[PDB]
Amino acid sequence: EPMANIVEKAVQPLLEEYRIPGMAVAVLKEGKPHYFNYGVANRESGRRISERTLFEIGSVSKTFTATLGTYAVVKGGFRLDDKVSQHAPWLQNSAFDRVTMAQLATYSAGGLPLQFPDAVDSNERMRQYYRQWSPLYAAGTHREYSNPSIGLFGHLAASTLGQPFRQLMSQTLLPKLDLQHTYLEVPDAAMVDYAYGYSKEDKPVRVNPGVLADEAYGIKTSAADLIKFVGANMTGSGDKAVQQALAMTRTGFYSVGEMTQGLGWESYAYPVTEQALLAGNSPAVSFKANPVKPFVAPRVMGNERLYNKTGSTNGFGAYVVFVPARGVGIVMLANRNYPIEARVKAAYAIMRHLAP
Numbered sequence: 001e002p003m004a005n006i007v008e009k010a011v012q013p014l015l016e017e018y019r020i021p022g023m024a025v026a027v028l029k030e031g032k033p034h035y036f037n038y039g040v041a042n043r044e045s046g047r048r049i050s051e052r053t054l055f056e057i058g059s060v061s062k063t064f065t066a067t068l069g070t071y072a073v074v075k076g077g078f079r080l081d082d083k084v085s086q087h088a089p090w091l092q093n094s095a096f097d098r099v100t101m102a103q104l105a106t107y108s109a110g111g112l113p114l115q116f117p118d119a120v121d122s123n124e125r126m127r128q129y130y131r132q133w134s135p136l137y138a139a140g141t142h143r144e145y146s147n148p149s150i151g152l153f154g155h156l157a158a159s160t161l162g163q164p165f166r167q168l169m170s171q172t173l174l175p176k177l178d179l180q181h182t183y184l185e186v187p188d189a190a191m192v193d194y195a196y197g198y199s200k201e202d203k204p205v206r207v208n209p210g211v212l213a214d215e216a217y218g219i220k221t222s223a224a225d226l227i228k229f230v231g232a233n234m235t236g237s238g239d240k241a242v243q244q245a246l247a248m249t250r251t252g253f254y255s256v257g258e259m260t261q262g263l264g265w266e267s268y269a270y271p272v273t274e275q276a277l278l279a280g281n282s283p284a285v286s287f288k289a290n291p292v293k294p295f296v297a298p299r300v301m302g303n304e305r306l307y308n309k310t311g312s313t314n315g316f317g318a319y320v321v322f323v324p325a326r327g328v329g330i331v332m333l334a335n336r337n338y339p340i341e342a343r344v345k346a347a348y349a350i351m352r353h354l355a356p
Contacts, residue, residue, distance in 0.1 A: 009347040010150025018338035021048040026227035026330040041195040051224040055333040058311030061219040066264030069157040070248035104153035111136025151212030182221040197315015205315040230329035254292035319343035
């Protein structure tokens with residue numbers, strides 16, 4: 001049962017049903033990457049998808065943001081249990097005197113929404129938004145998946161090291177990770193590799209950045225670079241502080257059903273049922289506030305586990321899964337924002353073959 005056939009079997013129904021113009025799949029097993037490419041980067045240019053094509057990865061960016069945040073912890077900028085206002089004096093007398101940095105990262109501050117209101121379109125309006133925000137829930141009690149939440153985490157984490165987020169990401173974290181094809185903004189020389197997204201109206205689209213885009217959803221990368229990042233999260237980085245940062249993202253804070261929320265990465269015990277993985281990535285979790293099952297102490301989650309993250313933008317759909325104990329990882333990047341449940345089913349089938 002060759003890998004190539006297993007991947008084709010899982011991917012073709014996605015290409016068929018969702019008319020996906022281009023998809024890059026990377027599989028890591030036994031220390032070696034394998035690439036499976038489908039279709040075209042731009043329907044109006046000749047270049048085909050390869051493992052070098054740059055895609056918008058949307059919320060998979062949150063795993064990079066989380067790693068930048070834990071890097072700042074390693075470097076002494078903050079502790080995860082610090083109150084947010086310790087690192088944001090402009091938030092004195094706001095809800096953020098009682099919210100911790102970890103709660104921002106884990107979407108549990110108390111009902112921050114998925115997106116900023118569209119009127120929040122400047123730094124000053126962003127500051128005022130957080131100052132004025134009235135919680136819906138007590139800190140820590142409810143998970144509500146939120147860009148303002150983890151966005152503020154990344155913004156403040158960078159502040160604790162005295163650098164802008166984009167600078168710290170592009171000049172420190174990505175170079176130390178040896179990721180040479182990973183960008184918050186694609187440079188002119190790499191535009192040749194940058195796919196267009198295809199919307200639900202079948203129009204070519206690219207992300208026009210908004211407030212805290214870099215932190216919440218702004219990475220563009222290739223399947224080759226993203227599977228290198230997955231490998232770093234299993235067998236390590238040779239930069240000792242980056243390794244400490246990578247490991248710390250496995251810290252779990254609470255569970256929602258069979259999912260444990262860490263920093264960026266969400267994880268499951270492995271073996272894991274498909275049902276459990278579908279439920280944890282469903283709108284019941286991602287589109288409704290959930291009361292959490294809390295941990296007395298945040299806990300490093302282990303190797304015998306499946307770590308994952310979805311990402312979606314206008315015109316793009318990404319999914320990443322890996323099981324450290326097995327040394328297996330899967331990256332699936334597409335220029336269609338096709339259903340998360342379909343991403344999960346396809347990745348699950350591939351993973352069951354790779355790690356029976």
